[PDB]
Design a protein around this ligand. Structure first.
Ligand SMILES: CCCCCCCCCCCCCCCCCC(=O)OC[C@H](COP(=O)([O-])OCC(O)COP(=O)([O-])OC[C@@H](COC(=O)CCCCCCCCCCCCCCCCC)OC(=O)CCCCCCCCCCCCCCCCC)OC(=O)CCCCCCCCCCCCCCCCC
Ligand SMILES: CCCCCCCCCCCCCC(=O)SCCNC(=O)CCNC(=O)[C@@H](O)C(C)(C)COP(=O)(O)O
Ligand code: SF4
Ligand code: SF4
Ligand code: SF4
Ligand code: SF4
Ligand code: FES
Ligand SMILES: [K+]
Ligand SMILES: [Zn+2]
Lengths: 176, 95, 263, 96, 114, 360, 113, 126, 48, 208
């Protein structure tokens, strides 16, 4: 249940001593290393052609956040504040009131994406699949406050990415 | 269902708009106020009231485990429809 | 002294005659679960969540209403006490609606909390739940009666402390509904305290409705100034804004109630 | 995979290893990106009877630490456990 | 009220350690102004040392001033050896901070702080 | 040329992690552990999971324990690739870095397929794992492991018999066994000095008493034997991964105590008890009984410990994080005496140092 | 048989382990005689030292002495005998068989608070 | 001897590194927290808390968030007794004020009182 | 597609020269891919 | 209680209890409590004058051989008058066991440094100084190790706020990173998560 790395006493007969002296004087392991580097010279490189090729992702991927809707246009978030209760960065800020038809909806739904640790606890805490974390990772900004998302940005991300978000949830909801 | 203040600024579905004398309109100067134009209170109002023949109906938002928790809606009031607390779809007992 | 000796989990405790099993367990620092019991209301005994085992007694007793006999050993943590608790919590949650996210009582719910502490962790209820018609009792108390567990703290408060006698139970069986039976508007001067003593989300505050949630509120302990009673209150605030006003317990002033103006 | 047999033989010679049997680039041998839907199993507490939670309550069987000594014969000296058994050398590959 | 000492049995040994620490800082201040190339004068840094020592001039417990001498030696060791940068040395001189309102009336004017 | 005194000044990544843990729940404080030894994410997850499960008096299901051991050895392959390749890239050999990070890229794809994040998965949780394996993941782990031996072989072709690599590591950083025990060293820092000690053997956790692996032991206490120990640990991680792929059991992946682990989203939306338990686990969290534990696992850097104190509530009271790099970098000052300034970077390579776990 | 290496780095191979262990064990007992008889450290260490000394005297072999002293290699058994001797010389100075120096405060080890 | 005699009041305000603004102008409140009247549980009313005076919380100009400048605005401590709390407040130089513990008075509960012959304490329903 | 390429190269996009008014002849962007093709291009599915 | 409950290790519990009796009767000058947890961990609670005798005994005794210092930790408990709880986690490789040694101090009483027993402790108790302010007497190089160089206060004390008292930014006027009093654009929102119902009846503290 254990093995000894580097507990080999070398053979001291003239054959092995001449082997090690030929290794010293004729640089045999150095030519071995040159041969291994030369072997990688003639391989096809592992380089993908970004942006025209994309790295492989799964339907579980945790990228940009989005607020979703039912298949009626009604937004799924019913202001229950589980996602900011579980948010380990406290990146989520929610206010709420009954809207004009008496429905429990949010007035504020902020996610500071620069506090956010992208761990998907909000999408697993959400009882109505409202907040999800979409597949978008190509959303670098040029200013810090463009990453301080309010509810309108998250609803636009939901409307923007729903055709993909719904298919990824369709692929992964039986594991959840 | 976005409407517009007399300053030209769009109004969100919350009702938020900046005032005429509020300085914080300068953040949209040369840029845009991003609102979503699909108001949920207008979109759920377009769904027709579901006529059902039972005294109690259930709703889970469609999709089984993809919707919301399954709640049971009473329909004894004939004056008012029974509305889902999660999805806002509304129901009426047909008798 | 005429104190009798009773035992809570074998620990000796001297109680007054007339003490219930729940108060005898309270004297040793143990809180028996309850839904209908409230120490300022009359004893109902109709939720059966307080069912505790007396040893050498083949039947669990309602600890809110049963007086302690001398020499009883109250087994608050025994196996059939726990089976009684899990069974009664199963029947409490059988017809209870799945409203915990859209409920204002969520996070500060007795039914949630002692379902976590004393219930099981899953369901055997494979049937369709009931749905109760909502009642309109005024602009202050929002009423969603599917969440009612029929603990009748309503009726006891409005009958005894508010002195109104206009809430009750109509119907019978699982169709038993708490309400006014007519389109009546329950407007007492103390009418918002049924929000406090509703253990579940069947009676919530209509101005506070949907706005906040209890874990994110900061509880500041202050005084009422709406009248000269000096009612001790908790002003709960969230992010620099006042959210609601809850009472503090003060036995000499406002015992644990406040008026609707204060609230 | 698209390497010609001359470059493939040169590459195998300079590495000293057969490199086509173990390629580090992935091809059609990997799993399909579209999978059938699973049917996941449930745990042993998904039962309708003999399933009282107090008979499987893990958090409530934790007890406070038993105080052995407190300040409020010819008994054998003890160790915290028996001494650790000496490890056996590998039968698979000892490097001996 | 029988406590284990740190270094000083009573306040006279404690003041001896305060005095030696002050001597060490007073010797060090010209070197600190030179090699950190501070924009202060040597008299100004020595006034800051005297200010930091007069800040703790109310302490009557030997163990507390033993810890004050220990933390002052740690500050000195971080300043002699160049472990602090120029910014850490200039954090004693609150230069970018606005002058706080002192009297009742200006504190009333700006806000709610007492 | 000589080094007389080597004083590492740390805290340049001190973030006050284990004060931020005190104001968060146990599930909320779990993703702090991905960010400690950030090349060893699921191993630190497994350590914290074992600490919270040891306090909660619950155990993970068998399939969750096999998933934890599988991904712990995948994590060990990740960390020893990082160790050997940056230890070569600082000495100067820059090419096997680029060779082994394609295999490391494929293991980050395994993490992303199982969790959605390539590094900080938050996957191994108290109670088991968060989510089950997606279908076809184990086949691709097989296709990775079937070829990875050749990758270790050609790394070992580039470095092990090379005279220039050996002249940088053979007489460098010699640690005696008694000083390695005294200075709090752990893992390969002990096993390169000939100390037969490994927590997966002596104090075995989840299902490491059911897998079958050898433990490489050095002989001279130097940088070169610790290099060989890390390479042979990659070999034996491939062996454990083959055994985990063949011996994966069916079953659930969380503890079926829904007062600890959340119910499924299908039954959260159907059952009342399940919705209450989902609510109270994702807002309050599960309460842990009061007590203090020291749970330690064999991380790829050494003994990774959690001294976790609970006060009965749903947040940790104290959570001290024992990390290998702290004690190893404390021992850096002894390990570099009589050596040269070039030997110091080889000693910081043989002590596998990541300053997230050094600083917290 | 002349063990070639102990395997532990810095642990030199002892040529005569039996005589070294006999000297160390009798020297531990000589030092340990300076402790009072009611001290449990004296009784326990005399007990385990007499057991180890009987095992050392009763086995001429070194390998079987390793398997029944049950303490690893024989050179680290020698090292632990040295550590026990140094400990006993420190325990004479500390006198830790004396009564408790101070009771703790009343709720000092009470967890949770 | 190796034990000295310190006859002084225990004051560690110079050692804690807290600025003088947040020592001499803050008011600690030492109290048992009141029971949440939304609930019947009494487990949160067992320990003594120390909080401070709430300072200003203003609106963030960008996002509307609640900005603060008070460092001690989230600082709540937990004590077993009142005297430990007072000793900790006096040791750190904090000005404090103490509310005494409010226990509910013992009630005389009678289920038979709900069905009396000649008293007003009959229930009209059940 | 080219399924004889290795996994990562086997699916690719040639970006358009004008998307929503911007000349993207040289200014191609990773976020020019619409969400229905974003699953297929990132290999979240086998299905275009 | 088979599948979901952690199985109890009775053998190790009995062995660690017997070894706790052993350590308590060899060192009664310093040992105050000995307790074994339900998950089989042995804690020795000692008086702080016996840091060097108890640790040197556990390091050098033939039936201990706790040669490895795993971790060294302070815990701040403000309701105790000796608020700092210094925890020693030791590892025996000979007997394959772990022991916890615990002792106490307040802000002013020093603990004797244990670098003469374990050289691992050199940075650990220096971290305890940096984070808690517990001074360790007769330490080789005691100073800060993790906080910034001008840092005031000890951050892991529980009366120290989460965000501290000062924050940094670059200031272009003085060409220098400066320290200014801390102001959050969003305050850390404190969540009162504790349930009003008792969770663990076995841990119920007796009333007054
Ligand atoms: C040596 C001197 C150059 C001779 C050409 C050469 O070595 O071709 C590589 C050719 C193919 O090598 P491979 O690594 O197996 O490539 C497989 C590809 O996947 C198969 O190639 P492919 O599938 O990628 O096919 C497309 C490829 C086809 O590749 C070519 O046309 C090869 C380049 C020819 C020039 O064409 C291109 O990509 C266009 C490249 C245009 C520029 C090439 C460089 C020009 C340099 C001078 C200006 O090598 C051989 O056939 C072996 C060596 C032959 C030596 C002959 C004696 C001299
Ligand atoms: C560039 C800037 C460098 C800044 C350097 C900052 C270092 C700060 C070190 C501070 C060390 C101390 O505070 S120890 C002082 C505390 N001493 C006491 O409480 C005892 C009272 N001390 C005194 O009264 C002292 O004035 C004397 C000199 C000991 C006696 O004076 P009295 O007589 O009249
Ligand atoms: S992914 Fe995590 S950190 Fe980000 S908003 Fe969701 S819960 Fe918060
Ligand atoms: S958890 Fe979901 S429904 Fe609840 S507040 Fe958050 S996004 Fe809205
Ligand atoms: S009353 Fe309680 S259990 Fe019922 S829906 Fe509301 S929070 Fe949930
Ligand atoms: S509404 Fe509330 S207080 Fe009234 S009977 Fe029902 S559960 Fe009880
Ligand atoms: S509490 Fe006794 S039955 Fe309701
Ligand atoms: K209520
Ligand atoms: Zn619905």
């Amino acid at each position: 249940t254990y093995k000894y790395v580097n507990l080999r006493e070398p053979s001291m007969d003239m054959k092995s001593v001449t082997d090690r002296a030929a290794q010293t004087l004729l640089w045999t392991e150095l030519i071995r290393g040159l041969g291994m580097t030369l072997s990688y010279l003639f391989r096809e490189p592992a380089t993908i052609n970004y942006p025209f090729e994309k790295g492989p992702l799964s339907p579980r991927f945790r990228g940009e956040h989005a607020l979703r809707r039912y298949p009626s246009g009604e937004e799924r978030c019913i202001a229950c504040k589980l996602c900011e209760a579980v948010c380990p960065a406290q990146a989520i800020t929610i206010e709420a009131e009954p809207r004009a038809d008496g429905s429990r909806r949010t007035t504020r739904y902020d996610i500071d994406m620069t506090k956010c640790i992208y761990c998907g606890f909000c999408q697993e805490a959400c009882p109505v699949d409202a907040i999800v974390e979409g597949p978008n990772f190509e959303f670098s900004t040029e200013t810090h406050e463009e990453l301080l998302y309010n509810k309108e940005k998250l609803l636009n991300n939901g409307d923007k990415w729903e055709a993909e978000i719904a298919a990824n949830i369709q692929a992964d909801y039986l594991y959840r | 269902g976005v409407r517009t203040s007399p300053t030209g600024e769009k109004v969100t579905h919350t009702g938020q708009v900046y005032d005429d004398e509020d300085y914080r309109r300068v953040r949209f100067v040369g840029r845009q106020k991003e609102v979503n134009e699909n108001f949920a209170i207008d979109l759920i109002a377009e769904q027709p009231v579901s006529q059902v023949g039972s005294r109690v109906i259930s709703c889970d938002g469609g999709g089984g485990a993809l919707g919301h928790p399954r709640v049971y809606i009473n329909l004894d009031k004939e004056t008012k429809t029974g509305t889902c607390g999660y999805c806002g779809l509304q129901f009426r007992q047909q008798h | 002294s005429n104190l009798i000796e009773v035992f809570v989990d074998g620990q000796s405790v001297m109680v007054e005659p007339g003490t219930t099993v729940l108060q005898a367990c309270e004297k040793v620092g143990m809180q028996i679960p309850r839904f209908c019991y409230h120490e300022r209301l009359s004893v109902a005994g109709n939720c059966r969540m307080c069912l505790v085992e007396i040893e050498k007694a083949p039947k669990v007793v309602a600890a809110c209403a049963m007086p302690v006999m001398k020499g009883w050993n109250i087994l608050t943590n025994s196996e059939k006490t726990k089976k009684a608790r899990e069974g009664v919590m199963e029947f409490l949650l059988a017809n209870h609606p799945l409203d915990c996210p859209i409920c204002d009582q969520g996070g500060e719910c007795d039914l949630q909390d002692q379902s976590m502490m004393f219930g099981s962790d899953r369901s055997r209820f494979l049937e369709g739940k009931r749905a109760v018609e909502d009642k309109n009792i005024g602009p202050l108390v929002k009423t969603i009666m599917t969440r009612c567990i029929q603990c009748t703290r309503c009726i006891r408060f409005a009958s005894e402390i508010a002195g109104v006698d206009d809430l009750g139970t109509t119907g019978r069986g699982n169709d038993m509904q708490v309400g006014t039976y007519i389109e009546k508007m329950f407007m007492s001067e103390l009418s918002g305290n049924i929000i406090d003593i509703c253990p579940v989300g069947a009676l919530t505050s209509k101005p506070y409705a949907f706005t906040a949630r209890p874990w994110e509120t900061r509880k500041t302990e202050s005084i009422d100034v709406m009248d000269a009673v000096g009612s001790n209150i908790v002003v709960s605030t969230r992010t620099g804004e006042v959210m609601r006003i809850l009472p503090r317990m003060h036995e000499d002033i406002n015992e644990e109630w406040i008026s609707d103006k204060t609230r | 995979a698209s390497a010609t047999r001359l470059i493939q033989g040169l590459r195998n010679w300079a590495s000293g290893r057969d490199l086509q049997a173990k390629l580090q680039l992935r091809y059609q041998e990997i799993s399909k990106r579209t999978q059938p839907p699973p049917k996941l199993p449930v745990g042993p507490s998904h039962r309708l009877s003999n399933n009282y939670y107090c008979a499987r309550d893990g958090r409530r069987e934790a007890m406070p630490p038993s105080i052995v000594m407190s300040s409020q014969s010819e008994k054998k000296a003890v160790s915290p456990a028996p001494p650790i058994k000496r490890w056996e050398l590998s039968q698979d590959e000892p490097y001996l | 009220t029988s406590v284990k000492p740190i270094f000083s049995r009573d306040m006279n040994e404690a003041k001896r350690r305060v005095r030696e620490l002050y001597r060490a800082w007073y010797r060090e201040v010209p070197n600190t102004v030179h090699l950190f190339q501070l924009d202060i004068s040597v008299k100004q840094g020595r006034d800051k040392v005297r200010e930091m020592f007069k800040k703790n001039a109310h302490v009557t417990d030997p163990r507390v001033v033993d810890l004050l001498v220990i933390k002052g030696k740690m500050e000195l060791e971080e300043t002699i050896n160049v472990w602090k940068q120029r910014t850490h040395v200039m954090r004693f001189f609150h230069e970018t901070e606005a002058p706080r309102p002192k009297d009742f009336l200006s504190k009333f004017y700006v806000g709610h702080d007492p | 040329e000589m080094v007389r005194k080597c004083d590492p000044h740390i805290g340049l990544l001190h973030r006050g992690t284990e004060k931020l843990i005190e104001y968060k729940t146990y599930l909320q404080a779990l993703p702090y552990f991905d960010r400690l030894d950030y090349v060893s994410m699921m191993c630190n997850e497994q350590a914290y999971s074992l600490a919270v499960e040891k306090l909660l008096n619950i155990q993970p299901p068998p399939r969750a324990q096999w998933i934890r051991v599988l991904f712990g050895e995948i994590t060990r392959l990740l960390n020893h690739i990082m160790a050997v390749t940056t230890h070569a890239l600082d000495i100067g050999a820059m090419t096997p870095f680029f060779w082994m990070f394609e295999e490391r890229e494929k293991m980050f794809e395994f993490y992303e397929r199982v969790s959605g994040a390539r590094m900080h998965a938050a996957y191994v949780r108290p109670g088991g794992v968060h989510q089950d394996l997606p279908l076809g993941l184990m086949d691709d782990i097989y296709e990775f492991s079937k070829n990875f031996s050749l990758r270790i072989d050609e790394l070992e072709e580039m470095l092990t018999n090379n005279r220039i690599w050996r002249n940088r590591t053979v007489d460098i950083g010699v640690v005696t066994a008694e000083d390695a025990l005294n200075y709090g060293f752990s893992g390969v820092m002990l096993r390169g000095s000939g100390i037969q000690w490994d927590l997966r053997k002596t104090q075995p956790y989840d299902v490491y008493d059911q897998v079958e692996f050898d433990v490489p032991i050095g002989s001279r206490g130097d940088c070169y034997d610790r290099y060989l120990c890390r390479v042979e640990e990659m070999r034996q991680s491939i062996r454990i991964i083959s055994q985990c792929l063949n011996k994966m059991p069916p079953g659930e992946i969380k503890v079926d105590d829904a007062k600890v682990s959340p119910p499924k989203r299908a039954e959260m939306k159907t059952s009342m008890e399940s919705l209450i338990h989902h609510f109270k686990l994702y807002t309050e969290g599960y309460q842990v009984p009061p007590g203090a534990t020291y749970t330690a696992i064999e991380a790829p850097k050494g003994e990774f410990g959690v001294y976790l104190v609970s006060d009965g509530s749903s947040r940790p009271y104290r959570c001290k994080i024992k990390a290998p790099g702290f004690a190893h970098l404390a021992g850096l000052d002894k390990m570099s005496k009589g050596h040269m300034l070039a030997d110091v970077v080889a000693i910081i390579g043989t002590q596998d140092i990541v300053f997230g776990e050094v600083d917290r | 048989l002349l063990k070639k290496t102990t395997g532990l780095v810095g642990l030199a191979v002892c040529e005569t382990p039996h005589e070294r262990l006999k000297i160390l064990y009798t020297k531990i007992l000589d030092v340990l005689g300076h402790i009072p008889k009611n001290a449990a450290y004296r009784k326990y260490t005399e007990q385990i030292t007499n057991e180890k000394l009987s095992i050392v005297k009763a086995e001429p072999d070194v390998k079987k002495l390793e398997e029944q002293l049950q303490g690893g290699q024989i050179e680290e058994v020698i090292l632990q005998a040295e550590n026990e001797l140094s400990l006993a010389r420190k325990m004479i100075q500390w006198k830790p068989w004396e009564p408790l120096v101070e009771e703790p405060p009343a709720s000092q080890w009470k967890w949770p608070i | 001897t190796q034990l000295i005699t310190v006859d002084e009041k225990l004051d560690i305000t110079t050692l804690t590194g807290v600025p003088e603004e947040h020592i001499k102008t803050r008011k600690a409140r030492i109290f048992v927290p009141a029971r949440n009247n939304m609930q019947s549980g009494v487990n949160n009313t067992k320990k003594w808390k120390m909080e401070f005076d709430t300072r200003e919380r203003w609106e963030n100009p960008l996002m509307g968030w609640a900005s603060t400048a008070d460092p001690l605005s989230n600082l709540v401590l937990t004590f077993s007794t009142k005297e430990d709390a007072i000793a900790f407040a006096e040791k750190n130089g904090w000005s404090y004020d103490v509310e005494e513990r409010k226990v509910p008075k013992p009630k005389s509960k009678s289920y038979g009182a709900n069905f009396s012959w000649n008293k007003r304490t009959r229930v009209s329903t059940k | 597609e080219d399924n004889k390429q290795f996994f990562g190269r086997h699916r690719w996009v040639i970006y358009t020269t004008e998307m929503n008014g911007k000349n993207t002849f040289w200014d191609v962007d990773g976020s020019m891919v619409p969400p229905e093709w974003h699953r297929w291009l990132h290999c979240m599915t086998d299905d275009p | 209680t088979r599948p979901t409950v952690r199985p109890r290790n009775d053998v190790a519990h009995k062995q660690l209890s017997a070894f706790g009796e052993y350590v308590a009767e060899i060192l009664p000058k310093y040992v105050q409590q000995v307790q074994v947890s339900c998950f089989s961990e042995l804690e020795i609670c000692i008086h702080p004058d016996g840091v060097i005798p108890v640790l040197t005994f556990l390091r050098d005794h033939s039936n201990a051989q706790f040669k490895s210092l795993a971790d060294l930790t302070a815990v701040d408990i403000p309701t105790r008058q000796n608020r700092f709880e210094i925890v020693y986690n030791l590892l025996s490789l000979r007997f394959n066991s772990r022991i916890r040694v615990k002792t106490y101090t307040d802000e002013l009483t020093p603990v004797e440094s244990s670098v003469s027993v374990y050289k691992a402790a050199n940075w650990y108790e220096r971290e305890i100084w940096d984070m808690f302010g517990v001074f360790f007497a007769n330490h080789p190089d005691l100073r800060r190790i993790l906080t910034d160089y001008g840092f005031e206060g000890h951050p892991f004390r529980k009366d120290f706020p989460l965000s501290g008292y000062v924050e940094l930014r670059y200031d272009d006027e003085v060409k220098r990173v400066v320290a200014e009093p801390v102001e959050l654009a969003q305050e850390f929102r404190k969540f009162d998560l504790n349930s009003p119902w008792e969770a663990f009846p076995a841990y119920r503290q007796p009333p007054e």
